[PDB]
Design an enzyme around this catalytic site. Structure first.
Site, mmCIF file in Angstrom:
data_model
loop_
_atom_site.group_PDB
_atom_site.id
_atom_site.type_symbol
_atom_site.label_atom_id
_atom_site.label_comp_id
_atom_site.label_asym_id
_atom_site.label_seq_id
_atom_site.Cartn_x
_atom_site.Cartn_y
_atom_site.Cartn_z
ATOM 1 N N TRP C 80 93.123 -1.825 30.988
ATOM 2 C CA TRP C 80 93.719 -3.004 31.603
ATOM 3 C C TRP C 80 94.335 -4.045 30.619
ATOM 4 O O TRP C 80 95.106 -4.941 31.060
ATOM 5 C CB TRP C 80 92.720 -3.697 32.559
ATOM 6 C CG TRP C 80 92.140 -2.780 33.648
ATOM 7 C CD1 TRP C 80 90.869 -2.279 33.703
ATOM 8 C CD2 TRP C 80 92.812 -2.283 34.805
ATOM 9 N NE1 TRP C 80 90.703 -1.483 34.820
ATOM 10 C CE2 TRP C 80 91.886 -1.475 35.518
ATOM 11 C CE3 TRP C 80 94.085 -2.467 35.333
ATOM 12 C CZ2 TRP C 80 92.217 -0.849 36.755
ATOM 13 C CZ3 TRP C 80 94.433 -1.839 36.548
ATOM 14 C CH2 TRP C 80 93.497 -1.048 37.250
ATOM 15 N N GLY C 114 95.501 -9.396 37.648
ATOM 16 C CA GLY C 114 94.890 -9.884 36.419
ATOM 17 C C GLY C 114 94.414 -11.325 36.614
ATOM 18 O O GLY C 114 94.353 -12.143 35.633
ATOM 19 N N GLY C 115 94.084 -11.678 37.859
ATOM 20 C CA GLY C 115 93.559 -13.047 38.117
ATOM 21 C C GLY C 115 94.528 -14.199 37.813
ATOM 22 O O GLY C 115 94.078 -15.323 37.653
ATOM 23 N N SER C 196 95.667 -7.221 43.884
ATOM 24 C CA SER C 196 94.822 -8.395 43.527
ATOM 25 C C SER C 196 95.708 -9.639 43.368
ATOM 26 O O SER C 196 96.474 -9.967 44.264
ATOM 27 C CB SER C 196 94.015 -8.063 42.242
ATOM 28 O OG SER C 196 92.891 -8.915 42.072
ATOM 29 N N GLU C 323 85.061 -3.155 46.280
ATOM 30 C CA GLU C 323 85.748 -4.231 45.563
ATOM 31 C C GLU C 323 84.870 -5.035 44.565
ATOM 32 O O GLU C 323 85.300 -5.294 43.451
ATOM 33 C CB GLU C 323 86.349 -5.223 46.547
ATOM 34 C CG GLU C 323 87.432 -4.677 47.442
ATOM 35 C CD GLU C 323 88.774 -4.419 46.708
ATOM 36 O OE1 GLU C 323 88.882 -4.709 45.479
ATOM 37 O OE2 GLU C 323 89.721 -3.912 47.387
ATOM 38 N N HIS C 436 87.362 -1.737 42.581
ATOM 39 C CA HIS C 436 88.556 -2.584 42.585
ATOM 40 C C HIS C 436 89.500 -2.081 41.497
ATOM 41 O O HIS C 436 89.052 -1.910 40.373
ATOM 42 C CB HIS C 436 88.081 -3.994 42.219
ATOM 43 C CG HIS C 436 89.185 -4.997 42.090
ATOM 44 N ND1 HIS C 436 89.828 -5.539 43.184
ATOM 45 C CD2 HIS C 436 89.709 -5.613 40.995
ATOM 46 C CE1 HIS C 436 90.734 -6.414 42.763
ATOM 47 N NE2 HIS C 436 90.686 -6.474 41.438
#
Ligand SMILES: *[C@@H]1O[C@H](CO[C@H]2O[C@@H](C)[C@@H](O)[C@@H](O)[C@@H]2O)[C@@H](O[C@@H]2O[C@H](CO)[C@@H](O)[C@H](O)[C@H]2NC(C)=O)[C@H](O)[C@H]1NC(C)=O
Ligand SMILES: *[C@@H]1O[C@H](CO[C@H]2O[C@@H](C)[C@@H](O)[C@@H](O)[C@@H]2O)[C@@H](O[C@@H]2O[C@H](CO)[C@@H](O)[C@H](O)[C@H]2NC(C)=O)[C@H](O)[C@H]1NC(C)=O
Ligand SMILES: *[C@@H]1O[C@H](CO[C@H]2O[C@@H](C)[C@@H](O)[C@@H](O)[C@@H]2O)[C@@H](O[C@@H]2O[C@H](CO)[C@@H](O)[C@H](O)[C@H]2NC(C)=O)[C@H](O)[C@H]1NC(C)=O
Ligand SMILES: *[C@H]1O[C@H](CO[C@H]2O[C@@H](C)[C@@H](O)[C@@H](O)[C@@H]2O)[C@@H](O[C@@H]2O[C@H](CO)[C@@H](O)[C@H](O)[C@H]2NC(C)=O)[C@H](O)[C@H]1NC(C)=O
Ligand SMILES: *[C@H]1O[C@H](CO[C@H]2O[C@@H](C)[C@@H](O)[C@@H](O)[C@@H]2O)[C@@H](O[C@@H]2O[C@H](CO)[C@@H](O)[C@H](O)[C@H]2NC(C)=O)[C@H](O)[C@H]1NC(C)=O
Ligand SMILES: *[C@H]1O[C@H](CO[C@H]2O[C@@H](C)[C@@H](O)[C@@H](O)[C@@H]2O)[C@@H](O[C@@H]2O[C@H](CO)[C@@H](O)[C@H](O)[C@H]2NC(C)=O)[C@H](O)[C@H]1NC(C)=O
Ligand SMILES: *[C@@H]1O[C@H](CO)[C@@H](O)[C@H](O)[C@H]1NC(C)=O
Ligand SMILES: *[C@@H]1O[C@H](CO)[C@@H](O)[C@H](O)[C@H]1NC(C)=O
Ligand SMILES: *[C@@H]1O[C@H](CO)[C@@H](O)[C@H](O)[C@H]1NC(C)=O
Ligand SMILES: *[C@@H]1O[C@H](CO)[C@@H](O)[C@H](O)[C@H]1NC(C)=O
Ligand SMILES: *[C@@H]1O[C@H](CO)[C@@H](O)[C@H](O)[C@H]1NC(C)=O
Ligand SMILES: *[C@@H]1O[C@H](CO)[C@@H](O)[C@H](O)[C@H]1NC(C)=O
Ligand SMILES: *[C@@H]1O[C@H](CO)[C@@H](O)[C@H](O)[C@H]1NC(C)=O
Ligand SMILES: *[C@@H]1O[C@H](CO)[C@@H](O)[C@H](O)[C@H]1NC(C)=O
Ligand SMILES: *[C@@H]1O[C@H](CO)[C@@H](O)[C@H](O)[C@H]1NC(C)=O
Ligand SMILES: *[C@@H]1O[C@H](CO)[C@@H](O)[C@H](O)[C@H]1NC(C)=O
Ligand SMILES: *[C@@H]1O[C@H](CO)[C@@H](O)[C@H](O)[C@H]1NC(C)=O
Ligand SMILES: *[C@@H]1O[C@H](CO)[C@@H](O)[C@H](O)[C@H]1NC(C)=O
Ligand SMILES: CN1C=CC=C/C1=C\NO
Ligand SMILES: CN1C=CC=C/C1=C\NO
Ligand SMILES: CN1C=CC=C/C1=C\NO
Ligand SMILES: [Cl-]
Ligand SMILES: [Cl-]
Ligand SMILES: [Cl-]
Ligand SMILES: [Cl-]
Ligand SMILES: [Cl-]
Ligand SMILES: [Cl-]
Ligand SMILES: [Cl-]
Ligand SMILES: [Cl-]
Ligand SMILES: [Cl-]
Ligand SMILES: [K+]
Ligand SMILES: [K+]
Ligand SMILES: [K+]
Ligand SMILES: [K+]
Ligand SMILES: [K+]
Ligand SMILES: [K+]
Lengths: 527, 527, 527
Positions: C80, C114-115, C196, C323, C436
């Protein structure tokens, strides 16, 4: 320094601190040629335009009008009297914008009431700075002509065509369409709102083809054009113009020569004689009001409403619990703002005379009959209360509910409220209850100012109302969606649901005043 | 002096006093080149245009036509004969506007009847000044070509294409679209209205693609194109044109040489021979009428109607109680306007011969059968009444009701009336009842003139009809909303509600002539 | 050599062999001025334009971001982390087109998650070459700014207005509208898809008026803006910007002087201090995210959603079975990716502290209560499983299902999926289940590459998903119509049907997590 370039020139505003934030106010921007000299009694003419900076930093002149002098020194009446100089030179408007300048804000446009004889946009209870600050809407308000100077009609004659004050309002709407994007507003999201004659005006703009494209939706507080005081018949309008002439020494032979003479009178002389153009007035006398002019209004409005000829959009409509009480102390015998106004049967009968001057004896007995079958104790306040209800149901509540049914039958969403909170600061006495005009300060968010001696519960009510009005203007749906609030259901003929507005509990109720309105609506008109 | 600048020139009108008010009349404005010389029998050509002022101060020439001379000196027949000089030079129209000049008035456009053989827009019963005065509509009416000069057909050949009188009307509609805003009218709010052949014409404009954009809605009084007299078949049209030639010495070999010869005849000679182009006429003979020309009318109209190919808009359709009676005294044996016309069975049978000349014996017996099962007294008036009904139901009432069902099945609102008031001033005898043509003077508001010897109840009926027609033109809904009137419900297949128009009581009824129309509509056409 | 002329210049691509075919890749095309120096923290500015050929043959710089270093050398976390150099100079996008060049292909536009603090479009699991090859869609992906550099807000101040990363995405959408027809794409057929925070972004574009005309429909994988992590409140945003200042020695008096100081810091110093602007973070901390800026977002989005103010089009929405599990090993006590993470009641309670830092004791007990009524064996894994569900249901699943109900109530078709397949190559342990982020590689078609050590059944699942997403983008209906597949029914409030995605059997089920979401949705928000 905040300067905005408009189609007619530069205007400078001023900054104001509101609730730890900033609002920019442009007060007194002109929007038409001053209706003076040859222009008196005529449709407003478009603005010629200025080079240089117009300072919009103080409220402008209020229009010529008679003033309320029944209670000198008393705040309850005098809060409604103009707080700027009267002048025929009065066609100005005001703009409040959030700081910083919004990108594409919804616009709220206020039209004041005053029976079409009085009023002004600079009153403290119409101050738009709280709405701009709290909801980031833009708020606009205009002065428009009143009394004979706004509504004198000689129908068909452009020297005095009728409805000048309505054209004044319409010309301010165009001004918003042409100029508001420059202040950060969205001319495609304009909601009109108005109270009493201001609400009747909003209802007539829904009917006027020339207003169709100047707004998105509408809010009507205690008024609608089918209220018995709101439209002068063609016959009455001519009697009144001719009486006025006669009183000022202007009777002529050529109608156009009547108007030329009336244009030479000083404003005071026209105003002094306005009250007498009518054989007998009531406290709700509208000596000079809207007419079927063939122009603003192409047919009798009852007929447009019935046959579905009006702008299709959403409406928000409502009334206060004791609409009729304010009027009882301007003439009904036995009434006083300084005592409990316990009246007898006889005094009631005399009050009906005062409120229903051209009505047959049978017409009056029928009202007495509908309103005096007591339940049932012989309470001393029986007659005092029945007279307030009579006046309020006939003049405000039943016409509001009837406009809402008829409007909604053609397919659009409508929302109806019943305001039942009495201001903790009300200077009028207790018996007068939840008076006509006393929701306005809730709608404008005065009780959000903590310094102002309103209660905590009043703060919360005003905040919720301001949110619901704002959501209505932006989204067409007067919901408060975040604080577990009661949903406001659409008003449909058949169910006729409405929402109550009060400090304790918000309720969904059905068929407001059902028995009383059946009386006013289906029987009284025959009488 | 009232002068209006049109696309083709200036026109001057005249002022008229009507009911204490003023109407401006423009009478005889030209709207096409005079169809003379090489232009006879051709589509109307567009107007070349004039410099200077055209005086529109008197009715123009009525079109060439045969005249009714069955009752010289009798007002009942002669009220329908032209009251201006006949001339091929006849393509003029009339405009009545309210005073003062309206802002954006609805327009009512009248198309007269006369079997497509006769008629004129200057008749007293078509005078538009009352509608303009009372309802502030603008009223327009046009002369259009009739008889062979309007409808001679050699289908496919532009020297004589058919339907010239319909193109005359269409060209007047365009004139309204191009010029009426200058008279204060709204070209976007035009309703056509017409009676008998005039109503059949209105129905064909609903079907004609070139008329689609020249009007908003339509009113059909006693006629519709599927009436048996209203459309000449392609076959009949050629037989008739060739017979006409033969009679005037114009038979040729080259069709175009037939028309060139016919263009050299004087009008009288064409007119004198019109009556004989048909082997046997009836009193409702339409020797030269509408045809399927491939142009105005692109297919057989029964097929357009059935398959939903027509302008989608609202319609108002109706008939009078005794449509058929007027015709009985122009040929049926035993009838007279000067006695009670009690006829025998035998005379009835002979009358069917006169009205149904090409029909088999079985066809005739079937009519006798449907109409003579008496209920039941042997009343002497049995046969006299049955013959009027026969003639009226076949020619007017059942085709009107059938057009309304078929039109309404494709989704649009329709309204249907049954007129049952007999004028108190009717010069025809009592037995003839509520005659064909005698609603017109109610629609045009003649009984609003108090000087005219109509009763009070007739005044009120006319006022209510004029209001309902006006509301229909303006709003699409023929309601009278102010005086506790009966609502006029939409006519739907299935329920088939209609409104009765009379002096006593207005009623909602269902399925007019249900048994008779089942006979005319589903059985008789096979015969 | 493949060269395409765009509005700003020529770009050269490279050819790639995929499944015996060819795809052309344009990697790293710039789409805005580099947001450097005076441009840091500001809206992206439009591209100046180049003469010559821009080589789009390698992935561009990823945006400045903190990196995951909890498990150095472990593929499950490090897959990631960015795989290109970090740089403020990062506003580039990528285009994959089928070979040969398509005629009018649908366009799929990916927005990574990635928030809002991390992510990049060049990751292996976002590689668009398989979609282009297999479905002949065009695939576009953009880098957008994250962390303080993308979302620092001083609301109302254009030096730092908030939402810069969202405007970055919007500017890439415009780039597609202006340029994609030149690559053979159809700008009238653009579907956004995102996972997300990328899915939360897609949901906000549905709400943003400036995005309305830049796309056709939308796909939301595990995220939506009403997720509790997805929108920073105005209050939090100001606290955070001021804390950041304080930490970097930039506190000033003039807000604009705060931003000028922050523009002089090197990127590392801003990044190092991002983690501390918050008093206590959770593993899902979004220190700098979307705000109500008055610009991209005109009101609180919960209110837009509730009142129906968003693009009307079709949506495809879904979630994975586990999730919440990924997050437990970034802080919850007793958890480890290297053992079975059997935790006790006490450890559960401590984990709620870690995930619900500002929540009352009662708030926490209420969660414990909803999630620990065991059925029923005393299974050791009870607490470990309940904590994953808690985290997943609150943060992902219940907000997804709630957005879908509310969206669908205004009339548009919606489709909802529940992904329950655990990748055979998953480097994380078994207890973490269907994690998730681990549907992405199915959607992008990685298991279609036979060389890659996924099973046969995984190949078939990916092929079916890729077809359903493609049919959704092209036709609005996520069906696989050729291989006897289960029809995916629309999600309606009331029935709430969804489709399960797995290797064994595809099922239609109703009311996902019904009891849990009633808890999160109707009770927890009051707490
Ligand atoms: C309430 O007051 C009314 C109003 O009239 C009076 O105003 C009062 C406050 C009073 O002090 C006085 O100055 C003034 O006249 C009273 O109505 C009046 O009743 C008196 C009977 O004494 C009559 O003289 C008047 O006709 C009448 N005035 C009007 C305008 O109607 C009323 O009686 C009193 N009611 C109470 C105390 O219940
Ligand atoms: C009603 O009148 C008709 C019409 O014909 C006649 O008109 C009358 C007013 C009469 O005075 C006379 O001048 C004229 O002939 C009568 O029909 C006629 O009936 C007579 C029988 O004597 C025959 O000679 C005719 O064939 C016939 N004429 C036509 C045109 O049909 C009818 O008898 C009479 N009916 C009454 C009084 O009931
Ligand atoms: C599963 O592992 C956790 C995580 O913490 C540990 O990681 C392990 C793989 C272990 O070898 C060790 O290196 C590391 O501390 C264990 O949680 C830890 O539990 C121990 C009890 O001995 C405590 O010292 C720690 O507080 C705690 N750490 C954290 C971060 O919570 C856990 O006990 C173990 N569980 C099993 C095997 O079921
Ligand atoms: C409007 O027309 C007359 C006008 O008479 C008026 O003279 C005016 C200049 C004005 O001062 C006004 O006060 C005065 O009325 C009205 O006539 C009234 O009716 C009564 C009947 O008893 C007569 O006595 C008077 O002419 C007059 N009233 C009074 C009190 O003086 C007329 O009624 C009116 N039209 C209406 C009400 O519809
Ligand atoms: C149309 O075609 C012929 C035309 O014959 C006609 O000659 C014309 C100039 C005209 O004067 C007209 O009166 C005359 O009819 C029609 O032939 C008729 O049919 C009968 C049959 O018995 C013959 O005797 C005649 O030719 C003629 N009738 C009469 C009374 O003279 C033909 O019938 C017609 N087409 C139709 C009706 O459809
Ligand atoms: C945001 O405002 C203050 C900011 O205080 C902070 O100083 C920053 C520069 C940053 O380093 C940050 O870690 C620190 O919190 C918050 O105050 C917190 O509340 C507690 C209450 O007990 C105080 O002790 C501190 O001032 C501070 N916390 C810690 C752990 O140091 C404030 O709470 C916050 N607003 C929120 C959470 O809504
Ligand atoms: C408007 O206000 C400013 C001072 O506050 C001044 O400079 C300017 O001249 C004013 N315009 C006038 C007084 O016309
Ligand atoms: C404001 O909103 C309207 C739609 O309501 C849109 O067409 C207009 O262009 C917008 N203007 C802006 C953002 O300036
Ligand atoms: C009346 O005088 C006016 C204005 O001077 C004039 O224009 C008009 O024609 C006159 N009308 C009559 C009827 O005297
Ligand atoms: C909603 O929340 C709080 C009360 O909990 C209050 O401060 C605020 O005024 C409320 N908002 C509205 C719009 O009523
Ligand atoms: C039209 O009428 C007026 C007189 O009333 C006259 O001046 C004008 O010349 C007329 N036009 C003619 C007769 O052509
Ligand atoms: C008249 O009404 C129509 C709509 O029916 C409108 O478009 C037109 O502009 C109006 N014209 C006027 C007032 O002149
Ligand atoms: C008939 O004569 C016309 C008109 O003069 C001519 O144009 C046409 O060609 C001719 N047709 C035949 C068939 O003789
Ligand atoms: C309505 O009112 C009166 C009768 O009370 C009458 O004069 C008028 O003609 C009526 N109006 C219509 C349109 O029928
Ligand atoms: C792009 O790539 C080609 C060689 O593969 C080269 O000819 C061209 O100069 C390149 N552009 C650069 C390095 O800027
Ligand atoms: C692509 O499709 C659209 C409709 O979705 C159409 O209007 C457009 O012109 C097409 N363009 C092509 C084939 O280049
Ligand atoms: C702060 O400084 C900025 C940028 O130099 C300036 O433009 C602004 O007017 C100043 N505002 C205040 C309140 O000092
Ligand atoms: C449909 O057919 C075969 C299996 O019989 C397979 O190769 C192919 O992947 C299937 N297609 C899709 C889109 O799932
Ligand atoms: C005198 N007045 C005018 C307009 C609105 C309200 C009002 C007083 N209301 O009690
Ligand atoms: C002869 N006529 C012509 C058109 C309309 C009516 C009419 C007479 N009707 O009785
Ligand atoms: C760290 N991360 C960021 C975006 C999407 C997924 C993701 C990991 N998921 O397990
Ligand atoms: Cl009594
Ligand atoms: Cl609606
Ligand atoms: Cl109820
Ligand atoms: Cl017999
Ligand atoms: Cl309709
Ligand atoms: Cl029935
Ligand atoms: Cl415990
Ligand atoms: Cl849909
Ligand atoms: Cl179920
Ligand atoms: K009450
Ligand atoms: K009664
Ligand atoms: K009858
Ligand atoms: K039969
Ligand atoms: K499950
Ligand atoms: K609970």
């Amino acid at each position: 320094d905040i300067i905005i370039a408009t189609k007619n020139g530069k205007v400078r505003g001023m900054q104001l601190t509101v609730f730890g934030g900033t609002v920019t106010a442009f007060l007194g921007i002109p929007y038409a040629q001053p209706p003076l000299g040859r222009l008196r009694f005529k449709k407003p003419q478009s603005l010629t335009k200025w080079s240089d900076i117009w300072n919009a930093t103080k409220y402008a002149n209020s229009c010529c009008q008679n003033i309320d002098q029944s209670f000198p020194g008393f705040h309850g009446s005098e809060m409604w009297n103009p707080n700027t100089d009267l002048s025929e030179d009065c066609l100005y408007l005001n703009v409040w914008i959030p700081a910083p300048k919004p990108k594409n804000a919804t616009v709220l446009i206020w039209i004041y009431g005053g029976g079409f004889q009085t009023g002004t946009s600079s009153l403290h209870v119409y101050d738009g700075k709280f709405l701009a600050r709290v909801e980031r809407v833009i708020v606009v308000s205009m002065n428009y002509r009143v009394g004979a100077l706004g509504f004198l009609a000689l129908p068909g004659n452009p020297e005095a065509p009728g409805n000048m004050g309505l054209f004044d309002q319409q010309l301010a709407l165009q001004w918003v369409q042409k100029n508001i994007a420059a202040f950060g507003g969205n001319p495609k999201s304009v909601t009109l709102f108005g109270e009493s004659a201001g609400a009747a005006s909003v209802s007539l703009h829904l009917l006027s083809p020339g207003s169709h494209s100047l707004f998105t939706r509408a809010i009507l507080q205690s008024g609608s054009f089918n209220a018995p005081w709101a439209v002068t018949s063609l016959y009455e309008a001519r009697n009144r113009t001719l009486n006025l002439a006669k009183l000022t020494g202007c009777s002529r032979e050529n109608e156009t020569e009547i108007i030329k003479c009336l244009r030479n009178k000083d404003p005071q002389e026209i105003l002094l004689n306005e009250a007498f153009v009518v054989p007998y007035g009531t406290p709700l006398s509208v000596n000079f009001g809207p007419t079927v002019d063939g122009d603003f209004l192409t047919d009798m409005p009852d007929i447009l409403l019935e046959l579905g000829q009006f702008k299709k959009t959403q409406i928000l409509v409502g009334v206060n619990k004791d609409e009729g009480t304010a009027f009882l102390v301007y003439g009904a015998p036995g009434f006083s703002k300084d005592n409990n106004s316990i009246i007898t049967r006889k005094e009631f009968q005399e009050g009906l005379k005062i409120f229903f001057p051209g009505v047959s004896e049978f017409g009056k007995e029928s009202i007495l009959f509908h309103y005096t079958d007591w339940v049932d104790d012989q309470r001393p306040e029986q007659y005092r209360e029945a007279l307030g209800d009579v006046v309020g149901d006939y003049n405000f509540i039943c016409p509001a509910l009837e406009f809402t049914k008829k409007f909604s039958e053609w397919g659009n969403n409508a929302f109806f409220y019943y305001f039942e909170h009495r201001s903790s600061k009300l200077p009028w006495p207790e018996w007068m209850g939840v008076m006509h005009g006393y929701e306005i300060e809730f709608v404008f968010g005065l009780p959000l100012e903590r310094r102002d001696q309103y209660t905590k519960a009043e703060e919360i009510l005003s905040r919720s109302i301001v949110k619901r009005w704002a959501n209505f203007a932006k989204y067409g749906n007067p919901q408060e969606t975040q604080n577990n609030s009661t949903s406001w259901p659409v008003f449909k003929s058949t169910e006729q649901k409405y929402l109550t507005l009060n400090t304790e509990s918000t309720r969904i109720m059905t068929k407001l005043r059902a028995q009383q309105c059946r009386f006013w609506t289906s029987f009284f008109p025959k009488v």
